[PDB]
Design a protein around this ligand. Structure first.
Ligand SMILES: *[C@@H]1O[C@H](CO)[C@@H](O[C@@H]2O[C@H](CO)[C@@H](O[C@@H]3O[C@H](CO[C@H]4O[C@H](CO)[C@@H](O)[C@H](O)[C@@H]4O)[C@@H](O)[C@H](O[C@H]4O[C@H](CO)[C@@H](O)[C@H](O)[C@@H]4O)[C@@H]3O)[C@H](O)[C@H]2NC(C)=O)[C@H](O)[C@H]1NC(C)=O
Ligand SMILES: *[C@@H]1O[C@H](CO)[C@@H](O[C@@H]2O[C@H](CO)[C@@H](O[C@@H]3O[C@H](CO[C@H]4O[C@H](CO)[C@@H](O)[C@H](O)[C@@H]4O)[C@@H](O)[C@H](O[C@H]4O[C@H](CO)[C@@H](O)[C@H](O)[C@@H]4O)[C@@H]3O)[C@H](O)[C@H]2NC(C)=O)[C@H](O)[C@H]1NC(C)=O
Ligand SMILES: *[C@@H]1O[C@H](CO)[C@@H](O[C@@H]2O[C@H](CO)[C@@H](O)[C@H](O)[C@H]2NC(C)=O)[C@H](O)[C@H]1NC(C)=O
Ligand SMILES: *[C@@H]1O[C@H](CO)[C@@H](O)[C@H](O)[C@H]1NC(C)=O
Ligand SMILES: *[C@@H]1O[C@H](CO)[C@@H](O)[C@H](O)[C@H]1NC(C)=O
Ligand SMILES: *[C@@H]1O[C@H](CO)[C@@H](O)[C@H](O)[C@H]1NC(C)=O
Ligand SMILES: *[C@@H]1O[C@H](CO)[C@@H](O)[C@H](O)[C@H]1NC(C)=O
Ligand SMILES: *[C@@H]1O[C@H](CO)[C@@H](O)[C@H](O)[C@H]1NC(C)=O
Ligand SMILES: *[C@@H]1O[C@H](CO)[C@@H](O)[C@H](O)[C@H]1NC(C)=O
Ligand SMILES: *[C@@H]1O[C@H](CO)[C@@H](O)[C@H](O)[C@H]1NC(C)=O
Ligand SMILES: *[C@@H]1O[C@H](CO)[C@@H](O)[C@H](O)[C@H]1NC(C)=O
Ligand SMILES: *[C@@H]1O[C@H](CO)[C@@H](O)[C@H](O)[C@H]1NC(C)=O
Ligand SMILES: *[C@@H]1O[C@H](CO)[C@@H](O)[C@H](O)[C@H]1NC(C)=O
Ligand SMILES: *[C@@H]1O[C@H](CO)[C@@H](O)[C@H](O)[C@H]1NC(C)=O
Ligand SMILES: *[C@@H]1O[C@H](CO)[C@@H](O)[C@H](O)[C@H]1NC(C)=O
Ligand SMILES: *[C@@H]1O[C@H](CO)[C@@H](O)[C@H](O)[C@H]1NC(C)=O
Ligand SMILES: *[C@@H]1O[C@H](CO)[C@@H](O)[C@H](O)[C@H]1NC(C)=O
Lengths: 125, 444, 441, 126, 121, 445
């Protein structure tokens, strides 16, 4: 399908559309010219912020990444079978509201530790 | 077995506000000049399977942008044009008396004044006819133009066409336009048939005050949409599922003359008139009108009770711009009397002829401080247009008589675009998210 | 033995220039600085950091100058022009209810102005101050700027009252603060911290003496780019404020006319009651103690065996020789010679007369004249002196007696006071260092 | 954690654990005024991208800390390693050298070129 | 040697300058806008190239080997001609507008590889 | 047994339009320099490309189009803050200047008077001045108005602003490169084998003139004649000379310039009087040089027309002064010089400098646009300028009956042609870093 045809997709099914969603993110009177110029700049800023975060978390090389952060019961209490193919991703997303900063902080810290540990030992005399 | 996985490129979005740009493709038309992007929307439609969305037309920021953008284009288009400041002089006038019917007695005045010309040193005496609506007595009598005590007036440039053409609004990267596909949607429902486009439908900016012209029709039934049905002080936007054809003319054959005032600045004169003097008129089929209103009433009573009697009275007192049906017909500005359309009470072929007046000074968008002068148009004017909807208000002040009254409404023009784009929403794309996987990062 | 290793995100910076944005109802400042500031200062004190500051080279001063000029020019852009009024005036003196501290100061003028219709003229009467009117030669007069510049009426609905202004760094930049007690404006500073934005600095415009600014804290602090060089101004920051109560005592009437379609002109009309000169009241006791404190601090720069005298101002135009400020929206010019008479050898207030002027050539710029519409009623304000601009009279022959004269200068020096503590730097995330490891291959 | 540049007083070694905060604060989050603001945003982006491009070129993309295959030259600096990492901050370090920037970058560019061409030959062989 | 210097060199030889080119791709209201528009476009083109290398799994390498088989239909020219005699300009003329075909194929190979790894982890 | 190999930083490009930025050197109030505040590099680069071929087409070149667009804009922006002369167009009363003038230049000037508004709105002042007849049109007793009064507002150019052309370098934005053809003898309408890449163009002065190309690039080997279509007689022929010819032009009379205030800081300048001799403006070009130069051009034309042809020169078609004469700016004044003295002879199968008269006018419809006008303040003192002719613009009459005799005449057209000549050797391309090729490697899985 095309962009967003995955809207009704389950979390499992949705994994096969990560490339259509990703490829469509980039690009397609004084006051008019400025407004459109501003819009283009903002699109770039949003793009870069997302890339920076994936970089920081160590998942910049993939559309799908396993992290070194455990899942918390304070975030959700559902089964793997409940979530995959028995859940539509759009709803899964509303269900994780307010957990964004918690999760990001954890991703940053676990990545900080992994890089540090590798520097101390794999690079060791 | 409890871990975190992260994804990029997930099909997720949030309600969002961004700036849209226009595009249109089909001479010196302002809309055509401005909306320079080619469109050609061949791949636009993507259906979203298993999607329900919340829409709310009354909070549509796109309406606000159209209002803003339309005014901006209008003003910009009039900047490189002739200023008529030099015409704020004492004007001497007498009555036009020749070949005038009763309906037009005193309507036109024969005026003259001392105008400047190319050299500062030279003056010229000129003559013109005016509609009484544009001229005020000073107090053989002396007059001034109505705008001179408030602001300078600018003459619109004759080559420039403001004729509305379909305009498509296109999203910037990172955004999408989401559309409701529900024939019974009243503007705020949780639509269960949703699709998206990158650029929307070509909707033309037709501007009017009592009834709505050249819009879309409802697919199956008349739909009555209001932000608060209960609130009497709201415009009710009624969309018809059938159009009503209306024919409207300006029967007098106008001679247009022009005089140079400045180095390249020219002013257009009304000249004189060929043919007996008559007022302007619009014609609506009586039977069609009666069927149309009855259809509205049935739906209206579904909201207000099917044992209710509904009176459709004419407009309330107020300024011409408020009480009449105002529209642009062939470049001319008409102010028509709609009382002839609202004289029935609903309980359990000839046309309707509506007299109309013409005014050349327009305080468009009700923004006081500026005025535009509409040059006279050579010959006669005829246009045909479709009534695709209307605006009503409740009169209120009920006595629990179960007899509601709905006079015609009015207001700014935001409601006009809200009606046409009631089905569209804008969202932002959000590519990142996580899930409760059982996979841990595999590390040394 | 050692290898090159590189890092990203290294906490270092370089001196740099950039554009700071402004952040905080018909007030020009409020309108422009529509962006709110965060409620949280977010200041990080740095440990083990010394930084070098130089207030005389702080480019933030230049930015503020540019920004203020822009706002004034923008603000007057949509206002009615008064060029239709550059006509010959017929004037006589106002002689009734005169105390003679203003004899001939105000004149009664009349003129034929254009009304909204071009073919109708009207006789109008008004009262003008001598400062705005010159003789052409019941004599023929003209406004002072009708031979040099266009005159624009400031819009009656727009306030220019200064509000605190905060400047904020763009991403990639940071602002460092000095905050070193008794710092003289230059060199290494050890009380350094990092901030996102400056505090709110109110852009009060004045000459000779600075009003409603920051204090010197514990001691009076005197700063100059060069102590010896008499070409430099001396910025004296007081450690306590001095209040001054200033008024325009006459009860005025405001009248207006249409000079065009939607074009209204405002004028002084009539005066209710009798005539009194504008004036400012300064406590002498406070003032005399204040000056002594200033001298005690000046002594560390010139020697404690030197005798000091304070002189009145030098010659120049009104904007140069008198103290100037905006009070109630009116423009006051005050004679401060009475404040600088004494010598220091090793309620009892003073009243300073003031003058009122309506046509203002702002910022020492010529070609853009602003007309100040009249204010009805009586004007009163109380302002705080927080510092002075002084110069050393110069001409010294090493006589051991020195004289300091009130100075003044470009508005940049006033902003230089509150911008004293701030510096902006660019962040440089990359760096290289030696280590033990070689890249794994 | 002190936050952005709170590491200014930290030793070079200690400061390595704050590289992430410094990275986070590099991205953001009247006709003339509008232009000035656009210029500011564009330049910030250009600087960000230039640093990322170079990390790519030098083969350290995705890392905050990267070992290279370029040996250290004592002509740039000849100091005790323990003094560098434990008794100096990064700001002091930068000031200590404030040189040889182009030399180092040239060495990094080439050592990456050597590594990628060697990988290409080996992979075509197997 | 220099920016786009060895333009006439063969495709194989040309590998020696690919880095110089990469390093040189990054840096009155009407005038100011023209310049901003130019800067923005340069950024957009740059990011699109990076995005493509990302989606194909080549973002970490200047020179990338992929698993997409070569189609003799696109070109039946020999490696002995392509790397040793032809230049990149000539080659591009002979790519005969099949670039987008290859892009679609590269994208599919990458999708398969990322999914397979995730199932294996 | 092949797969796809992906490369980044690939040395390929495409023809592409983009704008260039303007740069200038370190050498006031010069309009060009004021706009082009970006300095050029002290050390320019050029890389010759070995085993390179390219194609140039000067007739389809957006570099020229940009230069035109920007030069117009700059001109107009420069006049934005200058005093408008709107109040100046009042009934003008004139008599002819005949008492001090020789029969030559007699009748060129009129002595006119008018009542103009001064600093105060209540007053007018009586002003009289000298005018060229070309700026004044009769109304009908003697009664005149300014010639462009009934077309547009006239703005006085600001007297401090210099328009003297300075070399301008156009520089590529990142992602783009400028290619140039170094072939010693080519017409730039096709393939080139000596090609190099540069960051910026050679500086080109923004000289404005018609039917004659002044202070440009000189050909090095021979006269080179180029056109878009040789057989199309409706097109201009650009002739690039390989030897320059010096032309000495003057405005010989010593005037007096006066000025008045017409408003609050508004100054108007006009010619007050003339002291001494009154003579027509003129230009002097060596005859011998001209005949040899023209002969070289003819030899070059013969290469395209035949061994037995007859090459006739004649003057241009009649029409507006602006298209008919060799217009140019000399010392800041606008000259409209005769052409016929140089185009009379037919070529068959001290130095007697030719003197041509020049007209001068102060109201100019700049850039051949209608609806705008500028007034040239009078310039105080005697004016002399000496310049180099580096090229010519001619048309062929066509309508051939194969008589073998053909006529060439001076002619003009859009001023872009002047810049096409200077830019005939440059092209702009977009750099395209990605590409693919077949390989013997596959990824490890
Ligand atoms: C609802 O929708 C309808 C249908 O589109 C609109 O009706 C149209 O209104 C426009 C504007 O008045 C009409 O266009 C004008 O037609 C004039 C007459 O043209 C005749 O001859 C041509 C052939 O040459 C026929 O195609 C045409 O049907 C007529 O028989 C022209 O003279 C007008 O020209 C104007 O502009 C030119 C420059 O472009 C000037 O030189 C002219 O002097 C003049 O100013 C113009 O083209 C159009 O014909 C109507 N369509 C139909 C089917 O009748 C309604 O107006 C719209 N309602 C609302 C409220 O918007
Ligand atoms: C092709 O190229 C030639 C270059 O030689 C051009 O001819 C030159 O034109 C310029 C512009 O008018 C001349 O420069 C002017 O010269 C005037 C004469 O003064 C002479 O003596 C002084 C003594 O120091 C010299 O510096 C000066 O160069 C002259 O030799 C000056 O009075 C002018 O200054 C005034 O005008 C300028 C305008 O920019 C102002 O900036 C100044 O403040 C001042 O008001 C000016 O310097 C130059 O002299 C000419 N060269 C020759 C032959 O002498 C041709 O014009 C050009 N072709 C075309 C198409 O024009
Ligand atoms: C342009 O073509 C010439 C050949 O005409 C190239 O010369 C080669 O030089 C290398 C050494 O650097 C030799 O090993 C080759 O054998 C030469 N080629 C031939 C056919 O003899 C020259 O390198 C080419 N220039 C560029 C930039 O590629
Ligand atoms: C919507 O639901 C149907 C089952 O009724 C399913 O086959 C289809 O794939 C779903 N749509 C999407 C985008 O997954
Ligand atoms: C989950 O979050 C709570 C806070 O609500 C915290 O106390 C707990 O330690 C967290 N557990 C894990 C496994 O992260
Ligand atoms: C986030 O917190 C709010 C608090 O009111 C809650 O309503 C909402 O459901 C939460 N979102 C989640 C847990 O997805
Ligand atoms: C608006 O809607 C509410 C709920 O239906 C109703 O109570 C209210 O009366 C409405 N507005 C007014 C002013 O009637
Ligand atoms: C409605 O009709 C009445 C009947 O005379 C009239 O007075 C009134 O003005 C009409 N509408 C308006 C504008 O009030
Ligand atoms: C008016 O006032 C001036 C003060 O400048 C004085 O010189 C003059 O004599 C006065 N004239 C009259 C009428 O007394
Ligand atoms: C107004 O104009 C008349 C013209 O007769 C003149 O006498 C009178 O003095 C003028 N009045 C003023 C105040 O200038
Ligand atoms: C200030 O400048 C003068 C010269 O103008 C010099 O003699 C003196 O030493 C300078 N003093 C300082 C504080 O640098
Ligand atoms: C002078 O002052 C008295 C007292 O307020 C007042 O009654 C009188 O009218 C004033 N005279 C004039 C000319 O204003
Ligand atoms: C960098 O090298 C230059 C070469 O002379 C030197 O002047 C400069 O001081 C060096 N940088 C520092 C500050 O160490
Ligand atoms: C491919 O063609 C070239 C040139 O004709 C030839 O040298 C080569 O042997 C052919 N096949 C291969 C790859 O050997
Ligand atoms: C010019 O004007 C004078 C008036 O003195 C007249 O004698 C002469 O003939 C006129 N010349 C022409 C050709 O207009
Ligand atoms: C233009 O060139 C073509 C050859 O490409 C030629 O056939 C044609 O006749 C030329 N046009 C004219 C008017 O000679
Ligand atoms: C005659 O024509 C030939 C080409 O056929 C040319 O090479 C030769 O130079 C010409 N000779 C003359 C005298 O024009």
């Amino acid at each position: 399908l095309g962009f967003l045809g995955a809207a009704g997709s389950t979390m499992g099914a949705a994994s096969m559309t990560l490339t259509v969603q990703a490829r469509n993110l980039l690009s397609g009177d004084t006051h008019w010219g400025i407004k459109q110029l501003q819009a283009r700049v903002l699109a770039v800023e949003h793009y870069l912020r997302d890339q920076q975060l994936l970089g920081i978390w160590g998942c910049s090389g993939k559309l799908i990444c396993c992290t070194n952060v455990p899942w918390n019961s304070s975030w959700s209490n559902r089964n793997l079978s409940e979530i995959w193919d028995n859940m539509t991703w759009l709803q899964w997303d509303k269900e994780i509201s307010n957990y964004t900063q918690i999760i990001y902080g954890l991703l940053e810290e676990s990545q900080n530790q992994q890089e540090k540990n590798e520097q101390d030992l794999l690079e060791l005399d």
